[PDB]
């Protein structure tokens, strides 16, 4: 259990082809911990008179030798090129310290803006919903539904928000996957965990993914709908990308 | 081996002036046939103006037909193959009426494009096939001469 | 794997008509009961109650075929008051009414003017997917509303026309209409020793979306010809003028997320030059066959168009035309007046046709290549290849058509390339067709992996379902047994995977009053996306055809040979 | 010759898709076969039907071995069953040999009791309780004849498995007359009542009924004094289980000897009807009877093959009340009845009416005096009957029947029918069927008159009508009401389009299927069909009207 | 009301001698018609007699068909109704041939738990429907003679 303080809150676009180079002063042996809140952006890439949706997730985080971090991305089909808009918060374990500036139990009825700005950690218990936090609102959608509609849902969650009043202390980081990973009495982060393209209803249905906490284990499940690009024009191979970037977990103390 | 260029194996000397009567004389096929005919010396006597004793190319009905010919490994059409049959009948004044035909084959990959841009490609492909089928009708003309001479 | 069956029976005066039923494993029992309702010499409707068991209600497909003073016509008002499956697959739309409208008016006037209408308004975005509507035109999933006027004489032309889309809020596809599009053509020949023609087009593209660019295009193509025909040879040289003026608006979104920086007014003026030639030889071939004839016919062509940079004109309508043997002697690379390429090249070709005694052609081979003196640049060249060579004899072709007998045949076609050093296409066939029923055919189709990468979209080259090209081999056969039985078959088998692609069997007993037909087919029906292996669908069909007492006779072949996903074509 | 026949396919609401491809084998010109594959979609496998007609010295007959090796739906209902094979048998040999010898067969077996309820056959129906499997043989001449029978049954219901059956049924029937002024005749029986269970009685019976019939003749009258005896031995066994339960225990060997007297009589009058309608005559036939049977206590014989008989106008003058030699009743009554025809000029009977009453003297007792009437009566004009049959024209008919009653002061039974038939494809019919609930208790066992189903009797009002619209359509209707509960019982409606090449037919039925125990309300069974018959070269077509009428649960029967 | 006693019999004086023709003279139906005839003082002669002026009956085919006629509310049948049809042709020498017919309708209640006792009753319904049908035949004899006279 450590309390890294703060360095940056970058929300920019990649400078080079799938490369982000946020720079901040660092201390030697600081063991940089970077929490990502926008791992994936769906970018529409043009290909000779064709607008194609394409997820652009992040794969590797590399420290730039005591002068910042760099984020290397990779699109879904590995063919096109673009500049995504990832966004996250950079911390060093070794100068403001983040604090619990909002902690109440709320019910989200489909979409709720953040009462205060920060990195939100939540914890709920429902099996037919999924939660994802794009960049300004907690999005909840019905997950057992299979059709192309954007069906909303209501879940009751315990919301915690940190920013610059217990101090911010984090714990084990979980790599969210397609299998149940038990976390026990702990709060998961809130972010999109990838994207999904499926032949459904005659369209190239594109959705984002999100956490699905049932019992006390988390798992990637389908979420808000991005768009339906018709299959009369072009037909795309299916994909179910799950981002490899870990999600922070904190104990239920706040 | 000797190659004696050619010996007027163009449109037979008999059919050096004819009338291109056609169901639709303003379509793409009729203009395509006219081009090949003019390039072959044949002057197209104004539509049924002279009294008689001149042949007539009576262009018939065309039939374009696009079908699948190969599939990818996920059962998706890869190659189409267009086929365009174009009929015709030559009237020799008095003697008889002899039939001609044409059959053009074209293959191409199914390129996923827009709808305004995929129409322009399928219009160029059809217009090309009209030129190649009109060419085949200006062959098989040396044939009816040999079938009428016997 | 997935088995599914189909059992159908139906037909091929203000009273009813013969009804056709149908049963399928998905979308279960379905029953049509049409009814003709002639009411006038120029009006006759057709009300057709249609019952779908799966959705649990009855739709009402109507028509209004009319031939009044205007001209031909049609109507259609399919109406399903309530839908059961729809309320489960779309729990956001309150009412579940499904309907479609259609209209196909036409009509000449003084045999010069013309008209056309193509209304196709529908109810919800997922209509066309659910129903197999009889009448209706769908473009990119949208429903069009094309109008048109016209005028035509022996030379002049005019085709002012519009086209719109019925785009909803659940659809994100990008498509370009043309509202309106005036097109004028003028054809006057014998201007001295020349010929002349004019093309024109004023257009206005509007996207379905609200963030793609618009435009306004004016184009003119005055040309002058010069044919010169000898007896043994020919030549034809022409020059053309190309003018184009744009007016691009709504550029805010595209420019921000890119660096090409679409301009706001572009003028493109390019003069074209082309010279074509042909030469025909001849030789008696009495040494092999008595009284035959051979004809060796070289052909060459030189084309030249200057290079103008076109990175600041958005690609409203431009595909990339593919190749064949006769595609060598072409004018444009990109189809459409939007990305006119630039070329400085010479094309060469050879044929050899062998005639028989009745002057009937029997054989013809062909060879051709394109020699690029200067690499063809369009300003936005981003095509992947496998070589850095850019000038010279890049592409080769070929052709063959041997007619062995009146009931045999053969065909060819190869497209060797040197920018990858291997064959790019090898379409081939050979067939023996006696009459409509007895026929045998073999096929072959090849397309190298580099060709798929160099032509199709860039996500083909990184997908296991596309990146391996095509190497399939086929065979189709058919033979009647008795005077009333017919047998067909087909079997297309890949050779890069040693896995079949389609396999069909059919048997028909046809009489003068009824005919029954069975079917079998093992096709490819999608990718797994999980274990990365193809998925087959096995279907068995059973059809009973009620042939009324008339002359409608047929053993059933040539109708069941076009049922599998790789239909049969004459190729003779 | 050996060759296939015209196929036939139909979409049903019970099997989705069905297809018939009837082959027709052939052998020497007395036998044949019609092996018919029949595919059912929902059922899965293809049913095999193996009909085999024949002909020989004995006589004609047919067989049928419908066989479905695997049924999907039956597996769903009873997954515990190891296999779901379904089969049917039907042997119907019947014919005389050498003009004296005689044979009979009537056999039918099913795989499970729920065969006919879900399948459709020409040999049974859902409105069934048992399938009869009897064999017979015997030779008969003018005087003597013997016969050996083996009646058994295959009762479906499992709530009471006990069924009886007769192993040997030997019955000699001698005949001889012109013995003085009298006539003679002998009967006989010999049985072995087996039971399908283990704790039920068995038996062995012998009978020796003679007769001394004395006929008298006159120009108008016919008085027939008769007297017969009756003996009945027994060897009842296996009573160990039944002795404990019933109060009056069954016993061993029992003799039952009793005589019988009878007197008949009638006369025929005449009267010309020219007073009202000239050219018609009219008769009048009064008829009286007296019966007498001694009382024997028959409470120590289990009822194997005895059942109380109905009572129509001709049933009043019947000898016994229980058809079968187990519970010969005891009574001494009179019976009266007058019949009145009105012939026409051509002496063709065109109308008749009748009535009759069976006033008793003492009572009707058997020694099994435990049946509870609605209100017990001793003697009097207890039961009255009646019937009339009017032939209105060549195309109309009216037929009735009624059994009035003063014992319970309620009409026990009644039935009517009026029909207008012009040709085989155009008819209209009404019919009525009544049976008062008090009759149900007095006749059928106790379990019936305590369940709700068999309690209120029967009150049916049906209607049939068909009409050949134009000359290609054959619309047919039927609707049977049940005015007691004001709920319909059966409703059929079909239309057939018959052309020279094919014939399409629809259907719709709402039969009563079963009774739901929990809610105690009837369960209906809606069924829809769509049949396509491919005929073609068949010269004869037929509208099919006569076939569609005989397809519902209550089939049509012409009352004229 | 003037009713006398019917002097004319039911068997016409012409047919006081009858020849009984039947495929089965030993079965149940013949035994009935023999007894009905003797009840009317009719001397029945066989086929070997030399008299060719004696009228002759011909018992045709029978047909027993039972169907349900009233269903209980649980679905199983309650009341049956059996019919029976017998044809007969009477050949009177010196004139033409006349057909006659007979239908008998009778009923009974079904009882599935008394099957054997509901088949020893169905053998009694029939063996009483073989004696009212017979009476019907021997009651149209007057008709035949009367209509034959004309």
Author numbering:
A (entry chain C): 22 to 115, 139 to 208, 232 to 321
B (entry chain B), E (entry chain E): 19 to 168
C (entry chain A): 197 to 208, 225 to 784
D (entry chain D): 225 to 784
Q: What does the original paper state about this entry?
A:
The outer membrane (OM) of Gram-negative bacteria is a protective barrier generated by lipopolysaccharide (LPS), a complex glycolipid that makes up the outer leaflet of the OM. Following its synthesis and transport from the inner membrane, LPS is inserted into the OM by LptDE, an OM protein complex essential for most Gram-negative bacteria. Several copies of LptA link LptBCFG to LptDE in the OM, forming a protein bridge spanning the periplasmic space that functions as an ATP hydrolysis-driven conveyor belt for LPS molecules. Once they arrive at the LptDE complex, the LPS molecules are inserted into the outer leaflet of the OM via a process for which the details are not clear, but which must involve a separation of the first (S1) and last (S26) β-strands of the LptD barrel at the front of the complex to allow the translocating LPS molecule to move laterally into the OM from the lumen of the LptDE complex.
Data processing gave two major particle classes, the largest of which corresponded to a monomer and the other to a side-by-side dimer. Besides the main particle class for the LptDE–RBPOeko complex, dataset 1 contains a smaller class of LptDE dimers for which we could generate maps to ~3.4 Å. Interestingly, only one of the LptDE complexes has bound RBPOeko and represents the open state, whereas the other lacks the RBP and is closed. No particle classes were observed for dimeric open or closed complexes. The LptD barrels are stacked front-to-front, with complex formation likely driven by an intermolecular disulfide bond between the Cys725 residues of both LptD protomers. Given that the N-terminal jellyroll domains would clash with each other this dimeric complex is clearly nonphysiological, but it allows a good appreciation of the differences between the open and closed states of the LptDE complex. Neither the open nor the closed state shows any density for LptM, presumably due to the lack of the jellyroll domain.
